[PDB]
Amino acid sequence: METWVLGRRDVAEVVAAVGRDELMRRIIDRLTGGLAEIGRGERHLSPLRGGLERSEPVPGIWEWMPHREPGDHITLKTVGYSPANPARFGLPTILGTVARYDDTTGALTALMDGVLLTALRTGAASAVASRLLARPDSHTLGLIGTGAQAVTQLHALSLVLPLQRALVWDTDPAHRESFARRAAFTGVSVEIAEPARIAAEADVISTATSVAVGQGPVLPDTGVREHLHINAVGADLVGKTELPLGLLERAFVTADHPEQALREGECQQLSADRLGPQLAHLCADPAAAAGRQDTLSVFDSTGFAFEDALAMEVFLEAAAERDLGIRVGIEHHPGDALDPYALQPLPL
Amino acid sequence: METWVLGRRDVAEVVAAVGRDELMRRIIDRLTGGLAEIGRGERHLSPLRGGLERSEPVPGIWEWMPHREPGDHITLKTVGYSPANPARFGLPTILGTVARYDDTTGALTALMDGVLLTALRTGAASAVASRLLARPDSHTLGLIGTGAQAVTQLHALSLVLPLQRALVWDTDPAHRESFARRAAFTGVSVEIAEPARIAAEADVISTATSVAVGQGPVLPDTGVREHLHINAVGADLVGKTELPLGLLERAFVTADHPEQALREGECQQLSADRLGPQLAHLCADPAAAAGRQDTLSVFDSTGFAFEDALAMEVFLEAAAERDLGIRVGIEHHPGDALDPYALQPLPLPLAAP
Ligand SMILES: NC(=O)c1ccc[n+]([C@@H]2O[C@H](COP(=O)([O-])OP(=O)(O)OC[C@H]3O[C@@H](n4cnc5c(N)ncnc54)[C@H](O)[C@@H]3O)[C@@H](O)[C@H]2O)c1
Ligand SMILES: NC(=O)c1ccc[n+]([C@@H]2O[C@H](COP(=O)([O-])OP(=O)(O)OC[C@H]3O[C@@H](n4cnc5c(N)ncnc54)[C@H](O)[C@@H]3O)[C@@H](O)[C@H]2O)c1
């Protein structure tokens, strides 16, 4: 009968009441379970996303990301990547919303912020992959790109690895200099370091940049620690990549969603037959993976809508428990299903 | 900064304030103008829609339909086709919503009902096509399928043609028997007739059925009037058609969106090279359909997002005039754009507890 809307105030209230670490852990755990279900064939990857490329102000994309859970509900995330937003408008680069529709009737049942949820599930996905593929004694995290995603990359990874420090870089000096402040709550010490130094000293790296098509790589084609694990998180336009080919070619590479990664991930640079097993496979059999901790690995992360559905369920469970959100009758359900004009009662 | 939400009460208030006839005329005018722009090369057809097919309890589909106006905004209609809804749940078959996103920032700026808007723009499109291709003195309308769309097909067509009566059929007796009451506001007399009589007597027909994949036609190929114009409106799943092949083969056929129609319309049955000029080309230059009023013609209608964007503008102009809708901060816009955790929860009390 009415759409449950959770906007920014309620989302803030969930975080305040649950706690950042606990919320992140719930999302890590949900994703881990969901990916293992996919890996056993009990659930299935989302369809490929689509989007509309926008050339201005600077090149970006607005995308739609559906996922169906048959007999239950459809999730739709709608999300912009607008890399001029922070400096031009004081808005995040990544701006979106997540909707849920009843699978049986089509009715819009819930709608909420996608900005926070996106950042949380993206950190979580890197944590799932890094727990499997990073050495368990990893002490140094490298971050290339210190914008929004970097915050939750650090946070999530601090929950699953014994991180002592983060070596960080961004092409924008103001964005790298403010990272320590944004990261303070994790307790991981931050040091600004050049990409060459990050590549050489990190045990684990996340790359999460707004680099343009034709502007990589964001790390040099260098020698790295033999156990290095990299989460390649930047992803937006077709053509956009962050890692040097010569590094990728000697890595074990696991995509979150192989078809989508081959279009918009690092796997753009590779043949399909060069890809290792997908992340869900590793989640269903963590022993396919553990043996790969000690050699070079890359998690090619594009994000996919099932992750959004799961993250949304975490928020919906917490909100329901606290009676958060409002109810809005958005869709018109006529008094007679066969009469679009049965709008009664008319106001005044 | 916040999303403008026009929900069910506000859409109702627009209909009440503007009136059903005027609202539909505005939408007719707006679609005509926009289609002409496409026909002139000033604007472009929407990308092909996407969807997720769903088999139970009866096969339907949930679709997304984007249309971008570069530098201004992106419209997205999300809409379900679920043809067990009226009998099982008392909900319309077609259920959806229309959203607008700022093209520059990606921000969700507006969200509104898509149920009414869809019915209105779908009637309007048949009026646009029928004003071009039906005889101006058409008096008898036929309707095959007398569900929700059939109401606005009659309404819209009554506004552009001197209709005196409607001959109507549905496979569900209860649905064809309630059509007179739902149509009464148009003034057009309604009589139930079988499809063969409709085919023989109508000057203009609209087909808007929930017929299943592969289970057409819904109208037989038997002795039609020479000048008949048909709006083929049913469209959901790939494989769904309503008209007989033999009829289409001898008609002048115009699609609203050729590539889309070739996928989901009657044009599934035809080759691309056998289509007439698309509807946009006819709106840009009505002479491209010179003479076709007096011979067999088919408008193959599937719907496309630009139509929703134009209908949505009509509603937003009316709702802005009357200060309608609510404003809801749905998207999180952290004070520091690079800090997803820069949230602002309500402040805790200062005073001793
Ligand atoms: N994998 C996923 O699931 C997923 C989800 C959300 C976002 N993303 C992607 O992550 C990327 C970053 O998003 P964000 O929200 O952090 O954006 P952001 O604008 O907040 O941060 C991006 C940072 O990258 C920096 N940068 C640009 N080019 C660089 C380079 N060559 N080297 C180092 N730094 C550079 C920018 O100055 C900026 O600080 C985008 O590509 C986005 O689409 C991926
Ligand atoms: N072209 C467009 O732009 C557009 C837009 C909206 C809806 N549609 C489509 O129009 C069709 C009707 O939608 P609606 O909202 O009116 O649905 P509805 O369920 O309200 O009505 C459809 C009617 O078709 C009847 N029917 C089923 N099979 C039939 C047959 N063989 N002969 C006669 N009647 C039959 C049903 O009993 C029902 O009364 C659907 O395919 C829908 O997806 C098209």
Short mmCIF file of N, CA and C and ligand atoms in Angstrom, two decimals, chain A residues 49 63 77 81-83 86 92-94 118-119 121-122 125 144-150 169-172 175-176 195 207-212 215-218 232-236 240 242 256 301-304 307, chain B residues 337-338, ligand 1:
data_model
loop_
_atom_site.label_atom_id
_atom_site.label_comp_id
_atom_site.label_asym_id
_atom_site.label_seq_id
_atom_site.Cartn_x
_atom_site.Cartn_y
_atom_site.Cartn_z
N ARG A 49 25.06 -4.29 -15.71
CA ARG A 49 24.47 -2.97 -15.60
C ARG A 49 24.52 -2.22 -16.90
N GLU A 63 24.20 5.22 -14.19
CA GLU A 63 24.01 3.79 -14.40
C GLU A 63 22.78 3.28 -13.64
N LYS A 77 19.48 -0.20 -8.13
CA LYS A 77 20.30 0.96 -7.76
C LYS A 77 20.47 1.85 -8.98
N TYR A 81 28.21 8.70 -11.50
CA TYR A 81 29.65 8.95 -11.28
C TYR A 81 29.90 10.28 -12.02
N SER A 82 30.20 11.32 -11.24
CA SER A 82 30.34 12.68 -11.71
C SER A 82 31.56 13.23 -11.01
N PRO A 83 32.74 13.02 -11.63
CA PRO A 83 33.96 13.25 -10.89
C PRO A 83 34.29 14.67 -10.66
N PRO A 86 32.78 16.90 -6.34
CA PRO A 86 33.30 17.43 -5.09
C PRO A 86 33.83 18.88 -5.26
N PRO A 92 29.29 14.50 -3.44
CA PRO A 92 30.11 13.32 -3.82
C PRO A 92 30.05 12.99 -5.28
N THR A 93 31.18 12.49 -5.78
CA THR A 93 31.31 11.91 -7.07
C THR A 93 30.23 10.85 -7.34
N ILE A 94 30.04 9.96 -6.36
CA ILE A 94 29.07 8.86 -6.43
C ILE A 94 27.80 9.27 -5.69
N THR A 118 26.51 2.44 -0.82
CA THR A 118 27.51 2.13 -1.80
C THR A 118 28.92 2.04 -1.20
N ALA A 119 29.31 3.06 -0.45
CA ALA A 119 30.62 3.06 0.14
C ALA A 119 30.85 1.87 1.06
N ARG A 121 29.25 -1.23 1.10
CA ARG A 121 29.34 -2.50 0.45
C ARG A 121 30.62 -2.67 -0.41
N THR A 122 31.16 -1.56 -0.88
CA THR A 122 32.36 -1.59 -1.70
C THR A 122 33.57 -1.85 -0.83
N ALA A 125 33.28 -5.61 0.12
CA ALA A 125 33.65 -6.53 -0.95
C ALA A 125 35.15 -6.67 -0.99
N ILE A 144 45.56 4.18 -3.36
CA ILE A 144 45.78 5.08 -4.47
C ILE A 144 44.40 5.64 -4.80
N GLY A 145 44.25 6.94 -4.59
CA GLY A 145 42.95 7.57 -4.61
C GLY A 145 42.52 7.67 -3.16
N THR A 146 42.42 8.87 -2.62
CA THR A 146 42.02 9.06 -1.22
C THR A 146 40.73 9.91 -1.20
N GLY A 147 39.76 9.58 -2.05
CA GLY A 147 38.43 10.20 -1.95
C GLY A 147 37.50 9.42 -1.05
N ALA A 148 36.25 9.35 -1.46
CA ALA A 148 35.22 8.70 -0.63
C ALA A 148 35.43 7.24 -0.43
N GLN A 149 35.66 6.50 -1.53
CA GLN A 149 35.78 5.05 -1.38
C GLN A 149 36.95 4.65 -0.51
N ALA A 150 38.03 5.43 -0.57
CA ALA A 150 39.20 5.14 0.21
C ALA A 150 38.91 5.02 1.69
N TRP A 169 48.18 7.94 -1.51
CA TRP A 169 48.42 8.94 -2.51
C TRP A 169 47.16 9.32 -3.26
N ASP A 170 47.17 10.57 -3.70
CA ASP A 170 46.13 11.09 -4.54
C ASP A 170 46.81 12.17 -5.41
N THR A 171 46.37 12.30 -6.64
CA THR A 171 46.93 13.37 -7.53
C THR A 171 46.53 14.76 -7.06
N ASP A 172 45.49 14.89 -6.25
CA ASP A 172 45.06 16.17 -5.76
C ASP A 172 45.69 16.32 -4.36
N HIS A 175 43.27 16.52 -1.33
CA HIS A 175 42.59 15.23 -1.02
C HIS A 175 43.50 14.23 -0.29
N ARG A 176 44.80 14.13 -0.66
CA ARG A 176 45.66 13.32 0.12
C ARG A 176 45.97 13.91 1.52
N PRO A 195 53.19 6.69 -5.33
CA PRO A 195 52.79 5.35 -5.86
C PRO A 195 53.92 4.28 -5.96
N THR A 207 43.10 0.44 -5.10
CA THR A 207 43.09 1.53 -6.06
C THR A 207 41.64 1.95 -6.22
N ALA A 208 41.33 3.24 -5.96
CA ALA A 208 39.92 3.71 -6.01
C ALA A 208 39.93 5.16 -6.43
N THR A 209 40.30 5.36 -7.68
CA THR A 209 40.52 6.68 -8.26
C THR A 209 39.43 7.09 -9.25
N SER A 210 39.29 8.40 -9.46
CA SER A 210 38.50 8.89 -10.58
C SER A 210 39.38 9.15 -11.81
N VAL A 211 40.39 8.33 -12.04
CA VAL A 211 41.23 8.49 -13.24
C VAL A 211 40.37 8.42 -14.48
N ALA A 212 40.69 9.26 -15.46
CA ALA A 212 40.00 9.25 -16.74
C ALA A 212 40.40 8.10 -17.67
N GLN A 215 44.16 7.83 -19.02
CA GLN A 215 45.07 8.42 -18.05
C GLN A 215 45.71 7.43 -17.10
N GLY A 216 45.45 6.16 -17.16
CA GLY A 216 46.36 5.39 -16.25
C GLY A 216 47.87 5.22 -16.61
N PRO A 217 48.52 4.25 -15.99
CA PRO A 217 48.12 3.59 -14.75
C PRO A 217 48.34 4.48 -13.53
N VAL A 218 47.71 4.11 -12.41
CA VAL A 218 47.81 4.87 -11.17
C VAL A 218 48.94 4.38 -10.26
N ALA A 232 41.30 -3.77 -7.01
CA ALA A 232 41.15 -2.74 -8.10
C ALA A 232 39.70 -2.33 -8.10
N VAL A 233 39.42 -1.22 -7.44
CA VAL A 233 38.05 -0.77 -7.17
C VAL A 233 37.53 0.29 -8.11
N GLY A 234 38.40 1.11 -8.67
CA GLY A 234 37.90 2.13 -9.58
C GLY A 234 37.24 1.46 -10.77
N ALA A 235 36.16 2.06 -11.21
CA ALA A 235 35.29 1.48 -12.22
C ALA A 235 34.20 2.51 -12.51
N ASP A 236 34.02 2.82 -13.80
CA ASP A 236 33.00 3.74 -14.23
C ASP A 236 32.74 3.60 -15.67
N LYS A 240 38.13 2.62 -18.86
CA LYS A 240 38.83 3.07 -17.67
C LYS A 240 39.48 1.91 -16.90
N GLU A 242 43.17 1.07 -14.06
CA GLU A 242 44.06 1.68 -13.09
C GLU A 242 45.41 0.99 -12.98
N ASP A 256 34.74 -9.86 -9.33
CA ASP A 256 33.45 -10.03 -8.66
C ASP A 256 32.35 -10.54 -9.57
N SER A 301 37.21 -5.42 -8.93
CA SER A 301 35.93 -5.06 -8.35
C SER A 301 35.23 -3.98 -9.20
N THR A 302 34.03 -4.31 -9.70
CA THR A 302 33.15 -3.39 -10.42
C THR A 302 31.91 -3.00 -9.63
N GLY A 303 31.56 -3.86 -8.68
CA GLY A 303 30.31 -3.76 -7.95
C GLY A 303 29.16 -4.35 -8.76
N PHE A 304 28.21 -4.94 -8.06
CA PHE A 304 27.06 -5.46 -8.69
C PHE A 304 25.86 -5.48 -7.75
N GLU A 307 25.01 -6.98 -4.31
CA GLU A 307 25.69 -6.40 -3.14
C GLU A 307 24.86 -5.30 -2.52
N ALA B 337 32.50 16.04 0.98
CA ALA B 337 32.12 15.21 -0.17
C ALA B 337 32.96 13.94 -0.31
N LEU B 338 34.08 13.92 0.38
CA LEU B 338 35.02 12.80 0.33
C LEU B 338 34.92 11.94 1.56
N1 LIG C 1 33.91 -1.28 -7.42
C1 LIG C 1 32.79 -0.71 -6.99
O1 LIG C 1 31.93 -1.43 -6.52
C2 LIG C 1 32.67 0.78 -6.91
C3 LIG C 1 31.65 1.41 -6.10
C4 LIG C 1 31.69 2.84 -5.92
C5 LIG C 1 32.64 3.57 -6.61
N2 LIG C 1 33.49 2.94 -7.48
C6 LIG C 1 34.48 3.70 -8.23
O2 LIG C 1 35.59 4.09 -7.40
C7 LIG C 1 36.23 5.23 -8.04
C8 LIG C 1 36.45 6.28 -6.97
O3 LIG C 1 35.14 6.71 -6.43
P1 LIG C 1 35.11 7.74 -5.21
O4 LIG C 1 33.65 7.75 -4.70
O5 LIG C 1 36.18 7.49 -4.21
O6 LIG C 1 35.41 9.11 -6.00
P2 LIG C 1 36.08 10.44 -5.33
O7 LIG C 1 35.93 11.52 -6.39
O8 LIG C 1 35.51 10.66 -3.99
O9 LIG C 1 37.64 10.05 -5.15
C9 LIG C 1 38.44 9.77 -6.29
C10 LIG C 1 39.87 10.22 -6.04
O10 LIG C 1 40.66 9.72 -7.10
C11 LIG C 1 41.68 10.78 -7.24
N3 LIG C 1 42.40 10.55 -8.46
C12 LIG C 1 42.01 10.82 -9.76
N4 LIG C 1 42.96 10.35 -10.58
C13 LIG C 1 43.94 9.78 -9.87
C14 LIG C 1 45.24 9.13 -10.14
N5 LIG C 1 45.69 9.04 -11.39
N6 LIG C 1 45.94 8.71 -9.09
C15 LIG C 1 45.57 8.85 -7.82
N7 LIG C 1 44.40 9.45 -7.48
C16 LIG C 1 43.61 9.93 -8.47
C17 LIG C 1 40.89 12.09 -7.20
O11 LIG C 1 41.63 13.29 -6.95
C18 LIG C 1 39.96 11.74 -6.06
O12 LIG C 1 40.44 12.22 -4.78
C19 LIG C 1 35.31 5.67 -9.16
O13 LIG C 1 35.87 5.09 -10.32
C20 LIG C 1 33.96 5.03 -8.79
O14 LIG C 1 33.07 4.90 -9.89
C21 LIG C 1 33.57 1.58 -7.59
#
